[PDB]
Design a protein around this nucleic acid. Structure first.
Lengths: 95, 93, 62
DNA sequence: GATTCCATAAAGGATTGGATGAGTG
DNA sequence: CTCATCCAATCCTTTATGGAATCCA
């Protein structure tokens, strides 16, 4: 082998997904929702991950304009108003 | 009322995903940490709510993964749908 | 005074109605507790900690 | 067939606070 | 000044089973 065994930096975490059992419980919090396919919690576990990354990154931009290093709740508030995709969060967030 | 442990996904799981999209040394408030898990659970109910709303129209009683995909396309989340079916299809078999 | 996109406008109103029903039965989260579980709260008060407050590894120091 | 319940079991990872430096207000 | 990060050990949750009843193309 070469002079040294070459190495790879570890930045990954053990493959973790949001709990399916809880996702299903949140899905059923609605009276009319009564039956849910086996993989409907599966697609939300991945969909929620994509939703976190977009909303967090967009709020991050708001924090950098304020020249800060910590994301706070008001940042999310602006990211909700600014983007029309996050308009379903009017009653969850301020502003 | 109901239990917090049933309404919001674990805050540790949420915090981990938020930090993956930010610079290495970025900080995240606990206020910001907690409202994001409120937003995610509402995102679940906002998509599931309309996925079944068309299941009302369609006179079908369980909610398919594809009704969620169409509901996300309907609500403007079309970008997610393409990686989702790649993810979905592996799980299918 | 507030404006939202057409793709979800009616979708929001439908969700808005649902949520109102949930409040009628007080099925919504009012406030957050200091900790979810008393047992886990207690356990955390019994952990070995470093002079800097961090949880300590039991294995080290023989 | 799906799906929903109710159990029992195993397995696992989220929960969790003191001290202190980063950083907000 | 407030507060978010940093640790790891339990123990509640999750997942995995096995059944029960019900529904419907």
């Amino acid at each position: 082998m070469t002079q040294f065994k070459e190495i790879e930096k570890t930045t990954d975490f053990k493959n973790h997904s949001l709990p399916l059992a809880r996702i299903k419980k949140i899905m059923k919090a609605d009276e009319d929702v009564r039956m849910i396919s086996a993989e409907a919690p599966v697609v939300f576990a991945r969909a929620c991950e994509m939703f976190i990354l977009e909303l967090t990154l967009r709020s991050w931009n708001h924090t950098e304009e304020n020249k800060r290093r910590t994301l706070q709740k008001n940042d999310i508030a602006a990211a909700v108003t600014r983007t029309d995709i996050f308009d379903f969060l009017v009653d969850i967030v301020p502003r | 009322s109901p239990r917090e442990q049933d309404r919001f996904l674990p805050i540790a799981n949420v915090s981990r995903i938020m930090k993956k999209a930010l610079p290495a040394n970025a900080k995240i408030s606990k206020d910001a940490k907690e409202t994001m898990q409120e937003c995610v659970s509402e995102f679940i109910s906002f998509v599931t709510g309309e996925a079944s709303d068309k299941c009302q129209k369609e006179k079908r009683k369980t909610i398919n993964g594809d009704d969620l995909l169409w509901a996300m396309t309907t609500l403007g989340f079309e970008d997610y749908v393409e990686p989702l079916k790649v993810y979905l299809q592996r799980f299918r078999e | 005074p507030i404006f939202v996109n057409a793709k979800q406008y009616q979708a929001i109103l439908r969700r808005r109605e649902r949520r109102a029903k949930l409040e009628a039965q007080n099925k919504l989260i009012k406030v957050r507790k200091p900790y979810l579980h008393e047992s886990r709260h207690l356990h955390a008060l019994k952990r070995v900690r470093g002079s800097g407050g961090r949880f300590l590894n039991t294995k080290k120091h023989q």
